[PDB]
């Protein structure tokens, strides 16, 4: 049965709330397991303490660079990057959890959470999960974003794990 993971979000160190995600291991097992393992830290590295570096109101919240903390880094549990698993699932609306990349077959650890339907990303980013609880936390994170994604506060994954 599909695993469930959570992030505890903080804003300049102050608790905001918990968001949890269902990961669609039934449809993208490789991509789901990467995200699961990075949320638990079990490989010795992962999301805990990393930031949401890019937040663009009306579109999405992006994070997952835990190696450089500047938006350029991140790595998967399979190597620095891994191939696109499939594009079965689409960016249908708010709450979709999907992989960031720099072109074909460059998945690492960065990911984004849609706050709107982003249909033009279909076939280009691997969708592998969706928000289960705490979509209002993701909505609240938009208050700290901007047109080019620069954030006005430090938005962190203060804790994360598997439920």
């Amino acid at each position: 049965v599909n695993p469930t993971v959570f992030f505890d979000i903080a804003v300049d160190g102050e608790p905001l709330g918990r968001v949890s995600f269902e990961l669609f291991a039934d449809k993208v097992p490789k991509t789901a397991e990467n995200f699961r393992a990075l949320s638990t830290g079990e490989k010795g590295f992962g999301y805990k303490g990393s930031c949401f570096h890019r937040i663009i109101p009306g579109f999405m919240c992006q994070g997952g660079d835990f190696t450089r903390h500047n938006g350029t880094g991140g790595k998967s549990i399979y190597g620095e990057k891994f191939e696109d698993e499939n594009f079965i699932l689409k960016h249908t609306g708010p709450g979709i959890l999907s992989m960031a990349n720099a072109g074909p077959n460059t998945n690492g650890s960065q990911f984004f959470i849609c706050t709107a339907k982003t249909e033009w990303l279909d076939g280009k980013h691997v969708v592998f999960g969706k928000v289960k609880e705490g979509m209002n936390i993701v909505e609240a994170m938009e208050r700290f974003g901007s047109r080019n994604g620069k954030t006005s506060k430090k938005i962190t994954i203060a804790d994360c794990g598997q439920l």
Binding site: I56, P57, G58, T115, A116, E142, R143, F144, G145, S146, R147
Partner: protein
């Protein structure tokens, strides 16, 4: 895609434009005075059932730069004109703000909303009555707000979007 709306907030300094804008955007109240250079904000909202993106330009009310105020006046589609109900001067400044906006846009009716802010204060120098009688002359809505308690914030800007929609 959702439709985007470019709004512009104006008024003399100290009235609470940024505290109103920041209340709309971040639901937080700034009790400290931080006079504005220029700030832009984006927020998605639903107004009368339609999701849209507000792009809000928060401006400075320094008189030395009133010349360059023309430029954003070109790009803006609607204007929240803020005074403070304990500051008669900022109320008299409103007329000047209206005249210039009507100039730069070259129309008599620009999408526009008068805002009497700080209505939490026990002091008042601008009666509700005065600001109603002024707003009625111009033919635009009037709303008293309080950034401190958040009274009327959403109404001001949505009404403004609803004035842009009605003239769009």
């Amino acid at each position: 895609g959702m439709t985007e709306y470019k709004l512009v907030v104006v008024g003399a300094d100290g009235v609470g434009k940024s505290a109103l804008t920041i209340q709309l955007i971040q639901n937080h109240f700034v009790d400290e005075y931080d006079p504005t250079i220029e700030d832009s904000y984006r927020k998605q909202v639903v107004i009368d059932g339609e999701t849209c993106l507000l792009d809000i330009l928060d401006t400075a009310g320094q008189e030395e730069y009133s010349a360059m105020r023309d430029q954003y006046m070109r790009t803006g589609e609607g204007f929240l004109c803020v005074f403070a109900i304990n500051n008669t001067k900022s109320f008299e400044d409103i007329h000047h703000y209206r005249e210039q906006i009507k100039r730069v846009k070259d129309s008599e009716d620009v999408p526009m909303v008068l805002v009497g802010n700080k209505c939490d204060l026990p002091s008042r120098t601008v009666d509700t009555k005065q600001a109603q009688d002024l707003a009625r002359s111009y033919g635009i809505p009037f709303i008293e707000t309080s950034a401190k308690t958040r009274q009327g914030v959403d109404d001001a800007f949505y009404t403004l979007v609803r004035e842009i929609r009605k003239h769009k």
